[PDB]
Amino acid sequence: XXXXXXXXXXXXXXXXXXXXXXXXXXXXXXXXXXXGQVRLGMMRHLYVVVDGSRTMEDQDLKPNRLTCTLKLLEYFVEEYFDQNPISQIGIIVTKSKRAEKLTELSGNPRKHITSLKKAVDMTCHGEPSLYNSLSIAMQTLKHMPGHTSREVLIIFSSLTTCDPSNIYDLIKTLKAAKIRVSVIGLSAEVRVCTVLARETGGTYHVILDESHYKELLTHHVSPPPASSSSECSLIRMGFPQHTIXXXXXXXXXXXXXXXXXXXXXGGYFCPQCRAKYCELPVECKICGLTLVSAPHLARSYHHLFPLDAFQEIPLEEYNGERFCYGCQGELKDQHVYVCAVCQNVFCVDCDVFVHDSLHCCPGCIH
Amino acid sequence: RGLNRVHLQCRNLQEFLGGLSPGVLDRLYGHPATCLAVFRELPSLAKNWVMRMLFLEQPLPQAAVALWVKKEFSKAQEESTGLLSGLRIWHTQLLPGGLQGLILNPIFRQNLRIALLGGGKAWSDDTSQLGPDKHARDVPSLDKYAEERWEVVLHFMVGSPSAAVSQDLAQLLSQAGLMKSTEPGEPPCITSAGFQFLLLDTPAQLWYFMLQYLQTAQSRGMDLVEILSFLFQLSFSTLGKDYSVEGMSDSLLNFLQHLREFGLVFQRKRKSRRYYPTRLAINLSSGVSGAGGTVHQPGFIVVETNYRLYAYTESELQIALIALFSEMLYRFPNMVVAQVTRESVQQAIASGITAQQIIHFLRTRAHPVMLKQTPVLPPTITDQIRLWELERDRLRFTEGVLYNQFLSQVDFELLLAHARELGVLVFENSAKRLMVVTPAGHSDVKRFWKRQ
């Protein structure tokens, strides 16, 4: 009731500035990113199980937990389809001791984000059911092929995990069915989700803030490394070229579509069944082939020959290269970042840009 | 005031240059400053078309110009073509069949190509050799000089005891319609055009000075062409590098020292050979300084939903302006606290201000915490300001001439049709034969009545 005494003063002219700068510096933090030269699960049928519990309506977040969770899942679907194109998502809301396959396992963000914009309007009545949700996710994820790192992400809030049967035989089955389940938890640590996470192979985490929860979902965007158990197969792939209406439709093949459609003149075929698809990449609806344009293999090549660390040094320190090798600007701050191989000079803006978006050192290309 | 009230209309360099003599225009493009300055005023279509057709000696047919544009944009296309045509850029030629060729005015085209590439003139830059000059002036001190001189002129309009205007400028202010002298033992008042001049942007105020200054350029032996070439030579200059005067006539010397009185140019001495084009002179442009922030000065007025103005600026000028369109309560050495009362705005429109001046004034000086809002003003306050000015401006006046109580009905629509024919129809009736024609154009129909 006396927080007003948190503001001290020594000279009081820049001392209130020092207290405000200490507070504003203590109101921020940096992320923790991990590097690996290890095998990753790059075809990735992930399957999101959201709570629809009573505890979703609690107001620990700035809106209630349903709204914030659903907003960050909209961001999650966006960044996951932005970074892994082959993969798919399916969304289950778990509600009233039963599980509901809200959006089936598909690979385009339009249907999922449309369903989340719908699912803002829900009710969140009852206690969850981890049994039935893992059962529906298992039931769909039995028969995906063995090289797929089949992954479930349970955004789980409440504590009473109201199952209708025994949920250690599910964990033994899902251990044998080489699935991988990771739970992001709200407000607590629950022993059953801990056993599920450490036994199926996943990772369990509990949420402080908006920013920490964004860091956790960003941690689950990237393809997680594989165990010594998952099959390393060789999936047969198809690379259909784009085909416009051939020569002003001189002996074309006028089709409707293949999944309220208009008359398609041309587009993408299939090299297996010779059907008609508008969008690529799409799993072949009548063959079982997977269809790839092949920058969609190049969109996720940075995981395989990855980045390295920047040697971060704040001080002045021998810098005979005053200008940024990134964008030709002066280093007006005390943070200078130097690469490993070429050992050029980069600033903070070039650091965040290279390590988040461009994914390569501009020096090592030269 | 049996006409309408004095609405301060900025010409925006189109109604100025469109409406002159084409010989004046063909002399006007005889310096590359004027060609760049008319170039940047153009809309983006006409911009890209001039830069397309610049390197070309053949009159392209009309079909290609109409056929360079996608179909949906023809409504927003003919404005650029018509604006090029009326401004004597596109003079029309003929392909030897019937195709009406279009070609840029070779004075305009040659001097744009001088503005982009090497040239035969020298932009009237000169220096014999004078190095680091005796009392070289500093760039923030040029900013300070601009602020001092132009705020002295603004205080003179406001009517402070800082009246350092040297009475040629006061005669200019009386001649442009801003400070009316009445009962000639020296009260200089403010016209309502002066109040609307005050609430305007700084480049808009200076360009309105240059337009109403050259509106009466038939007085002192001045010519429009050389003065406008010197204005467009000023606003395409640099604060850092220094200039010289040798290469200017004596009427140019009188205009340049009158311009020194304006504060747009920092001299050192009257008989000197050097001028420093000030930061007011560079941002001389027919345009808008913004809707959230100004390059000149960052905004300083926080307008909260309490109808509450927080001005973070100490200046007697801007305090007087906020006194014009509001009423003021607290004054601290960093801040002024004012409230926008209904009665304050109804006082600000009794002296005559259409309240787009007020809303654009507050948008111009929007404090950088008031930014990061997409409606930078609270729309309750802004729509309340507009509703207050619509309560004050509810009468619309027109001088007319009456036709009433005709003996028939065929001559009724005959007089109405003759009014519509010569474009003098104002208001009509359907039932009781009560028509309004233009009174100045009435004598045509009146002598038609004496002819039938």
């Binding site: 416009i244 209406x245 002003x248 439709x249 008359x263 003149x265 | 390197f55 070309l56 000696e57 053949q58 392209l60 290609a64 056929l67 190509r113 590439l117 090497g118």
Partner: protein
């Protein structure tokens, strides 16, 4: 490699013609002829006759 290094080291010494060298007007007229809808680089494309 050696021939081209010699010729381009000699080339980029004497430089900057801006008025004269850049465009002949007949090349610009033929370019406008090409980018007009019946010439080269206008492929008679985006037709899509349905």
């Amino acid at each position: 490699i050696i021939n081209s290094f010699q010729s381009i080291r000699q080339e980029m010494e004497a430089y900057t013609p801006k008025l004269t060298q850049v465009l002949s007007s007949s090349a610009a007229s033929s370019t406008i002829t090409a980018l007009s809808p019946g010439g080269a680089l206008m492929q008679x494309x985006x037709x899509x006759x349905x």
